[PDB]
């Protein structure tokens, strides 16, 4: 149940705070840095409330455990050097227990003259070859046209989160100025010839000061 | 300070080992984290010395005599293993827990190969072509005159087996400049028609 925020997108020399919360009762919250390969780095952690602790690669950072519940990571004057993915974690107390994770934060930091851009998003229709030969149906999702480089695409089937079947590009492509990002659901030709499924693809992104959302939606056939 | 190899492969099925350098830290405690695509890194097993059996995924822990290594051995990886797997050790018992880089572990579904390759349009916008790559072999499928392909691999529930495997590779394109097609070990050229 451990919550931190999915994607956040700062300005130059902007300040944020990220709030993780957990649900445990745990005595022992932490903020951690993953930036492509250089494992998990400590950036503060809190054996208590209103207790911090520095960790190696704080300078840039601080941090307020308010209660039980929520630690807060501040970003002070964000930088470029801020950019990665932000992991809370928790434990009943600190060591040899295991830690608990959120899913993670992505924080991008851009140049206080480059703006987000949406991304397009569409569906493309399966190929009627593909049906026939293989008796299957691969719906590819494409979403182009974003910046910055992180976002997240996922599938819904008829209301429900769908992970059976589904290829999501774990890295964007870089397309000129912008970038894309590519997920195929494939699925059996009998739950494709079905007018009534409803095949959802969503894409999660950050604009203006906030968490939005494109969906797309294509039916199944006769 | 606390080393491990960048990636790992392994077919599914076959047992693969996952090694952690650690030759400064004498370890009071090893534990090992794996962290699946859209999750955050997940407790697998933790152990202060010998070997540790682990359920999920089955396999073990060893740690070597001097406490200053260990190896994490998947004893039946399947493609829901692949994840980037990581160590963290202690010093002692009220110092900091420290983490490798992490290893991404790769997992290779076992595949007949029928490759073929489709063109695809979308409602949304038609000035767009979506090339399909499906039911390939990796190592044999050659897509050298395209940068901006991504892959992936999927299960499908189909009739006869319960969870099939196969690769998808797909690139995209405005409309006129876009030539579907590849080159397949025994398969000679393939290229993509429409309806």
């Known amino acids: 149940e451990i919550n931190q925020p999915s994607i956040l997108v700062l300005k130059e020399d902007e300040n944020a705070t990220l709030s993780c919360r957990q649900n445990?009762?745990?005595?022992?919250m932490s903020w951690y840095l993953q930036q492509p390969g250089k494992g998990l780095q400590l950036i503060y952690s809190?054996?208590?409330?209103?207790?911090?602790n520095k960790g190696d690669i704080h300078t840039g950072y601080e941090a307020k455990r308010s209660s039980q519940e929520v630690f807060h990571l501040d970003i002070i004057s964000a930088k470029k050097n801020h950019s990665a993915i932000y992991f809370c974690?928790?434990?009943?107390?600190?060591?040899?227990?295991?830690?608990?994770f959120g899913q993670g934060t992505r924080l991008t930091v851009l140049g206080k003259n480059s703006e987000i851009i949406e991304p397009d998003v569409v569906i493309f229709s399966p190929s009627k070859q593909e049906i026939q030969e293989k008796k299957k149906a691969t719906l590819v999702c494409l979403a182009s046209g974003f910046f910055p480089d992180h976002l997240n695409l996922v599938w819904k089937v008829n209301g429900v989160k769908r992970t059976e079947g589904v290829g999501t590009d774990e890295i964007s492509t870089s397309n000129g100025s912008t970038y894309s990002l590519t997920s195929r659901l494939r699925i059996s030709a009998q739950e494709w010839f079905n007018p009534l499924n409803r095949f959802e693809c969503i894409a999660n992104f950050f604009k203006n000061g906030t968490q939005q959302s494109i969906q797309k939606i294509i039916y199944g056939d006769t | 300070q606390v080393q491990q190899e960048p990636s790992a492969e392994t077919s599914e099925g076959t047992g693969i080992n996952i090694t952690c350098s650690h030759p400064?830290?004498?370890?009071?405690?090893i534990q090992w984290y794996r962290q699946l695509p859209g999750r955050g890194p997940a407790f697998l097993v933790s152990?202060?010395?010998?070997?540790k059996e682990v359920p999920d995924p089955e396999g073990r822990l060893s740690v070597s005599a001097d406490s200053r290594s260990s190896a994490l051995w998947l004893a039946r990886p399947r493609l829901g293993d692949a994840a980037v797997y990581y160590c963290?050790?202690?010093?002692?018992?009220?110092?900091?827990?420290?983490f490798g880089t992490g290893t991404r572990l790769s997992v290779q579904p076992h595949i007949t190969p029928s490759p073929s390759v489709y063109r695809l349009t979308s409602e949304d916008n038609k000035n767009l072509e979506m090339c399909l790559i499906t039911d390939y072999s990796p190592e044999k499928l050659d897509l050298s005159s395209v940068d901006s392909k991504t892959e992936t691999v999927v299960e499908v529930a189909t009739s006869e087996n319960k969870h099939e495997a196969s690769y998808l590779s797909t690139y995209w394109a405005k409309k006129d400049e876009m030539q579907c097609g590849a080159k397949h070990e025994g398969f000679g050229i393939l290229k993509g028609d429409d309806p």
């Open positions: 974690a928790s434990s009943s107390y600190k060591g040899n227990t295991p830690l608990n």
């Open positions: 445990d009762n745990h005595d022992y």
């Open positions: 809190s054996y208590g409330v209103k207790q911090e």
């Open positions: 400064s830290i004498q370890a009071y405690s």
């Open positions: 152990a202060v010395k010998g070997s």
């Open positions: 963290a050790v202690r010093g002692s018992s009220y110092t900091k827990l420290t």
